[PDB]
Design a protein around this ligand. Sequence first.
Ligand SMILES: [Mg+2]
Ligand SMILES: [Mg+2]
Length: 472
Amino acid sequence: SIGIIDIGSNSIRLVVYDQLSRAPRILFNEKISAQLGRNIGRIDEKAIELAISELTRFWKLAQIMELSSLRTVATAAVRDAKNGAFLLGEIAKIGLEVEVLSGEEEGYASGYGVLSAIPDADGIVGDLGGGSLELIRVSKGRVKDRVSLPLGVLRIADIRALDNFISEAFKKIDWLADARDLPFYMVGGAWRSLAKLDMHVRHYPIPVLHNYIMSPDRPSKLIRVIQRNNPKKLKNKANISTSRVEQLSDAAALLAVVSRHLHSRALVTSAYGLREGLLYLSLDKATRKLDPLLWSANQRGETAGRFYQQGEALYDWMSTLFAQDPPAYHRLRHAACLLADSAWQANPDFRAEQILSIILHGRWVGLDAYGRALIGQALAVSYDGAMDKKITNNLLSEADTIRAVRWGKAIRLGMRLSGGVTTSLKKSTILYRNNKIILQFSGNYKLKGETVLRRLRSLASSFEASEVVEFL
Ligand SMILES: [Mg+2]
Ligand SMILES: [Mg+2]
């Protein structure tokens, strides 16, 4: 239902989202490699010709998709070309009014994009685009400070000396000194592509874009990877075809110098950038505070489940076993319960495989790799799978491996007992007391049956407990 066209100096992108919601699904995403800024200074005719044809396609797609809103933004970089104002008028005649973003508006959108995907972010956001580097301090749910620098990807080759430029620029930014030893949240296409390169180079058994973590030493090592490889093979094998390898080398150099000068403790990818920041700021303010993992997992069980979303009564029912879970884990148990019906159409013996890829390889935010592994292994267990551990890179502690097995067995007992109509679990309680796992019925006694209690035996076994069924 909504579209954003993001015009930069090094590429243009259309993204269509299913609705304006807390965590919307991407229906369509197309990046164009026209480089409006390369000829600064004047934008060259052939760039303009490429851009107007592509933008006209973006307009036409918006018409046939019947979008409820299409927003077009451009950077000040493009506007301030000698002929920038003329190009903006040529775009308007397509039917696309261009909203030119100041440095302030650009940095605020990129920073709230990271806060949308990572609500607890506390660090510096770096948006490396074609024409600018935006640096944004985020803390406490807010953008706190911001600077816009002329260090886009196109500008890096002209300098790269790179250390001295950053050193000089950084001296004038007085808030960097209070922001040391914090994460560096990377957004923009070049740095997201560099993280995909790192995943490939490292063979990291969970290739998650969102919240992928890199040491501050990785960028310097990636420069050497690019130099030590055939550029064509590297791009294709790492799934970053369309990236310009020379630009990626420049991006890595900049990342190394910026990270060192900011004293970044970790480099963290955000799947949400400027475009998702615009959406977040378009929300009602109270909607912004909703948890985007649980929002997105709720929507998935609504659209995929047999009886829409029944995970709420399931989470309520199973959580009396899990009251002592660490504070951060309750929302992960909840997200697993919301997704507990999402592989029902698969043949029984492959549902564990499916649900695991949905969790590990879905576009979830508000979650790190360890959390994906926890939810994914709980849900694999819920669908009668063993736990590979090598697909999850042995990330999990033994305590949390036991915890995931217990979550998964409780989920599947609840799902099998209720048939998936989890409202009926409102008349039941499942408890761990005195070395017993006790399924209590205060009502819906007819659900008990006999065979389904094999799931209770399994759960009891994972607790080293006596299976008990009690009617109250
Ligand atoms: Mg940008
Ligand atoms: Mg920019």
